[PDB]
Paper text:
Nervous necrosis virus is a member of the family Nodaviridae that contains two genera: Alphanodavirus, which usually infects insects, and Betanodavirus, also known as piscine nodavirus. Virions of the Nodaviridae, including NNV, are non-enveloped, 25–30 nm in diameter and contain 180 copies of a single type of [name] subunit arranged with T = 3 symmetry. The [name] precursor self-assembles into T = 3 provirions. Provirions mature by spontaneous autocatalytic cleavage of the [name] alpha post-assembly, producing proteins beta (38 kDa) and gamma (5 kDa) which remain part of the mature virion.
Here, we show that both transient expression of the [name] of Atlantic cod nervous necrosis virus (ACNNV) in Nicotiana benthamiana leaves or in transgenic tobacco BY-2 cells leads to the production of VLPs. For a detailed structural analysis of the plant- produced ACNNV VLPs, cryo-EM was performed on the sample prepared from N. benthamiana leaves. Single-particle image processing was carried out in Relion, which allowed us to determine the solution structure of the VLP to a global resolution of 3.7 Å. The ACNNV VLP is an isometric particle with T = 3 symmetry, consistent with previously reported structures of the grouper nervous necrosis virus (GNNV) VLPs which share ∼85 % sequence identity. The shell domain displays the highest local resolution which allowed the building of an atomic model of the capsid shell. The viral asymmetric unit is composed of three quasi equivalent copies of the [name] which have a characteristic jelly roll topology, with clear side-chain density. Three P-domains of the capsid protein interact and form spikes on the particle surface. The P-domains are attached to the rest of the capsid protein by a linker region and display lower local resolution, presumably as a result of flexibility. Overall, the cryo-EM analysis confirmed that the structure of the plant-produced VLPs is very similar that of material produced in other expression systems. When administered either intraperitoneally or intramuscularly to sea bass, the VLPs were shown to confer partial protection against subsequent challenge with ACNNV, indicating that plants can be used to produce effective vaccines for use in aquaculture.
Numbering used by the authors:
A (entry chain B), C (entry chain B), E (entry chain B): 52 to 214
B (entry chain C), D (entry chain C): 34 to 214
The structure:
């Protein structure tokens, strides 16, 4: 009928050797589809329609304190296929920027419409935006960032997919 | 008075032992060391169930009583290395005393799980079972241990790390007996 | 649906010749399973789950007054397979000790959980403890002890076993 | 906030165990049997010191704590034979844990000593040391055991007697530790 | 007749090269006898009986901040000859644990009886416990710990020893 899930889950993880990662180097650009969240990924294989109530992100990077580069992150509510720059992430509401040893918190501005789980011909009805984390400095040592999520959603209309 | 065939036994208070105790404290669980280079993501540092044996003052006092019920139970991680390490860890608490959960996704999912770098210590406020368990061993594990602690590394540490997890327990042992371990 | 039985029934009976029965000699060690009580044995072949409300024991030994040994009894809420000594029965709540011509009353401390009737892989869910009656003296003549019970239980969830 | 060389260890409650417990109960001390004809006057039936080992639930709980202080301590004799025996006994309690008092005159002299026939049971309300002792063994005996129980026959019994002495103890173990016996 | 001394004094000092000192490695295990404290050592060669009023310890380790091991300490009021482990120090009241660059404060639970100064056949009457400081990590560089004390005592009954 109608549920209300919470959770906290890894979205993605990337590793960067030294020398790589000038300004504008995209570390991770992935849309918020149910296939990426693990516990919602098993729960959106049941239902059909969900609507996010609150949704927040944390970056949680892991490097020694002698790194001396930095990152920027944001949340773009166009799930298009072209925003690869610093200035699109500058404009948005709830963006963060810090050095590589510091964790910050993205409090985005989502859509609060009512979406679908499966794929379709239109992209705007199945994912409420994109996360983009791109390096702004030029790092010294190997970093290892591990972005988290904090999702709360209200899945309904029971079915079953065959992915 | 006069003299019968046998006077009755005057053992008055027989089998009237103590009933309710409250033991608290803090004791470690386990401790390991990892050389440099070893310890990629998913490498299990420590996985030891909370049986009353690993808490040492409780295990000498649960050999008397039969049943215990954990009132408050918290954990502290305390890694020991300078701020030039740069790997990380993830800690959790899984109330299954089963034998297959070895991934980052299972540990992050539970309630009150933490993740931090090797030069930073965190604190677990877990979701324990709050039931009333047994002390002696048996065939089924789900009645004698309120879960497992699993701690595993997530990065690739640079120097030698040295973690030492602890445990702040409080319990209310009752129903007196004495067993043989 | 839900019943409430009472009763009073023989658990076991043993006989001891002269010379036998030093201290620590087990006369009867049997768990409280429904197969031992007679009227509950016919009634727990119907239902599946029972929960004891009140349960008490009496020893009722029968010997002439020139016996001059004694016994101890108790109730151990571990239905394990190893407690054969005096000191495990010493510790428990509601133990008794008297000479062979005297009856005493065990008022135990049971579990008040909700158990099963049939057998299973785990022993703790099918029997709320053990009765142990062991001689503490070194008797003179032939005794004949006959322990009783006084059980009250609330059987439910109807089925039928095939023992 | 900013990033230092090493964050301080946040182990908050370390070494804050329980302090005061009160254990009571009843447990036997020893038990013997005497054939007919044996057991003239002065024959020692039972002579065993009250070390915490002979009380079995206390000995599994004094392996934690360091010091105990006996609050109340009483004894019950309970012989088992019919009224055709006609010998006797004498019971006492000597607060020396030494090793030479084997006569009727030493046992009758103490406070709260009893004497009766074999078909009658009595009760000892002794004069214990009421100090604050230790639990582990050492060179000196006078700091770890609050006296001895000595019971010996006084007549010449006719049939087989069978005595079974008991002990009603209550104690207040404290100052937590853990030893190795 | 009766005095009241205070003070602050070195108990012991040890040095540990790199590689040595795994978990359970005893750095210093010495009883609190008057022969170890310096100012009380000259004052307990006068009198015979003392009784500690307040007595506290500090660890004061000295190493660069890149050490990354740690220690544990405590106070065991058995002056026996066998407690060499972590778990005996875990149980006691007023134990401390920190990394090698950090000083902590032991506030023990002593005996407050009235003791002797000289040696004797029994150990329990001449020393109110033991200090045990043992490494719990596996250190990187050379540390140099220097434990202190803070003793206050009330010596009496004048005599003179010949050690």
């Amino acid at each position: 009928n109608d549920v209300h899930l919470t959770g906290m889950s890894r979205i993605a993880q990337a590793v960067i050797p030294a020398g790589t990662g000038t300004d504008g180097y995209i570390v991770v650009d992935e849309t918020i589809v149910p296939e990426l969240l693990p516990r919602l990924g098993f729960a959106a294989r049941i239902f059909q329609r969900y609507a996010v109530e609150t949704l927040e992100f944390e970056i949680q990077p892991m490097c020694p304190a002698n790194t001396g580069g930095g990152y920027v992150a944001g949340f773009l509510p166009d799930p298009t296929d072209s925003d690869h720059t610093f200035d699109a992430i500058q404009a948005t509401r709830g963006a963060v920027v810090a050095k590589w040893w510091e964790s910050r918190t993205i409090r985005p501005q989502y859509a609060r419409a009512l979406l679908w789980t499966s794929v379709g011909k239109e992209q705007r009805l199945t994912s409420p935006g994109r996360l983009i984390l791109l390096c702004v400095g030029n790092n010294t040592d190997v970093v290892n960032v591990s972005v988290l999520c904090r999702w709360s959603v209200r899945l309904s209309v029971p079915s079953l997919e065959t992915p």
